[PDB]
Design a protein around this ligand. Structure first.
Ligand code: CL
Ligand code: CL
Lengths: 295, 295
């Protein structure tokens, strides 16, 4: 079975970036945003079904995959959110739904906060806002997510370390994120590997993690200060695991948005690849139930 | 001016290790234990003065410098504490004072807890027990001390990363720990570098950080559970910086010991090399004031 049958591969030229996009379908627009250390191919088990009923846009985040900044570039979520407005606008959409996984969900919620008239509906796949993540840091968090702290160290420490044997570190990371499950299509994996072998991609990824510590967290705090919330329907699909008090993802998203629903999914953090049929059932139901929002 | 004038370099053969020791002087015994990523040479600005009045023993911790386990070796603080009892015993001392810096202080307090009749007095240079460190973890801690989380990742992840360009990572680490101050004698630095270029040393260091997460923290908790405290006079000399509530080093040590004193030292964490004359004044006064304890 082919990867992304019928998707058309584009390169969009925006103000600050050259962005890889893959498109298919007609109907209401959906923008799907992958995470780390991946590319748009992470959507290969979900996007074709969606494209039966919707206009589907898959993008490589700035610096990831085949997308690149034109320069000391800005790799903050706010910058990558602007890339999405420009990308969708070029394609003919002023308003659209956003489905994000991992770093993509972080771009997505920032986009929804800053541009509430553009974002029709928002789905987070196993992500809460960075503000909430930082408040939860303890010994166990920092051991589990050691890379959040390594990749945020000043330039060029982590670039040196991860750049020595890049494919080894990429593969290790993917296995660890999948909890050892065999979820990576071997051809998707060669695309992930090729990107991670590019020093510019590894640098962009460190810059993402640096932004998460700094400007991205400042942005989230300023919204919390203002009482600024996502204005669209929100769905969160989370990994089935125990959540400490105040850390349940549904509870968290209800502090950020007035219209929130969600479900636990039995799988790893890698929801697009690990649990595509469970994700699809939820996504399709959510999009159907909020068809007015999409208008 | 020479490094360690008059010190005699020994190799002791213990049950589980081949240990590098350097000795000088006569009188009451002091055992000085360096930290990461260093060797016994870190004491070169302090040990000669002490050796005017005391029997001074400098050791490389198991796996560090020129010290090595005979094998899946145990690199827990309890194991390294046993090395110190055996080392001092061989040299002719059943009871002795311990002065530790960084990982050395961790070996030292474990030794004092487990073997209260052996440890006459204990000095910690800018260290509190690991139990207290773990309780303090938050976003800022994990960013500052990112390596505590990296080097504790399962074998052989951090060995791969730090082993790629070892001398670069060693030098970077030393500069960062010194807060950019020019405190490393160029010949001491070649000894630190040579050790870090040895894959067995890098592995031993990761094993130390793994133990800190696991068995070392379990040991400290069991003592806290039992209400077991250091029985000797304790001195703590700490870096002058702000301490959050419950995190002041004097306050912390008073929860672990009935007889505690200390002082703030204007310098980096690298007290032996950065502030030797301030450290000496305090050490000498402490040892003089507790001359009965040493008997
Ligand atoms: Cl994430
Ligand atoms: Cl330490």
């Amino acid at each position: 079975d082919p990867l992304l049958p019928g998707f058309d591969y584009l390169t969009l030229h925006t103000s600050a970036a050259r962005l890889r996009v893959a498109v298919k379908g007609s109907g209401p627009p959906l923008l799907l945003l992958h995470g780390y250390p991946q590319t748009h191919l992470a959507w290969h088990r979900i996007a074709p079904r969606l494209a039966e009923d919707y206009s589907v846009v898959l993008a490589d985040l700035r610096g990831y995959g085949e997308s690149r900044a034109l320069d000391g570039a800005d790799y903050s979520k706010a910058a990558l959110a602007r890339d999405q407005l420009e990308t969708m606008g070029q394609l003919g959409f002023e308003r659209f739904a956003v489905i994000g996984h991992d770093r993509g969900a972080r771009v997505g919620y920032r986009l929804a906060l800053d541009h509430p008239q553009a974002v029709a509906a928002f789905v987070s796949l196993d992500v809460v806002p960075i503000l909430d993540n930082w408040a939860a840091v303890n010994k166990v968090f920092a051991l589990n997510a050691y890379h959040w702290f390594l990749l945020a160290q000043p330039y060029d420490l982590p670039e040196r370390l991860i750049g020595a044997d890049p494919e080894h570190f990429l593969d290790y990371t993917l296995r660890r994120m999948a909890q050892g499950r065999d979820i990576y299509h071997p051809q998707a994996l060669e695309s992930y590997r090729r990107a991670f072998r590019d020093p510019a991609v590894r640098h962009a990824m460190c810059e993402d993690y640096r932004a998460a510590v700094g400007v991205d967290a400042d942005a989230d705090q300023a919204d919390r200060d203002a009482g600024r919330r996502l204005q669209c329907p929100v769905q969160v699909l989370w990994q089935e695991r125990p959540y400490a008090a105040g850390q349940h993802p549904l509870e968290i998203w209800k502090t950020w948005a007035g219209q929130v629903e969600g479900a636990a999914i039995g799988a790893s953090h890698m929801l697009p690849e690990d649990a595509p049929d469970a994700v699809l059932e939820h996504l399709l139901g959510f999009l159907a139930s909020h068809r007015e929002a999409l208008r």
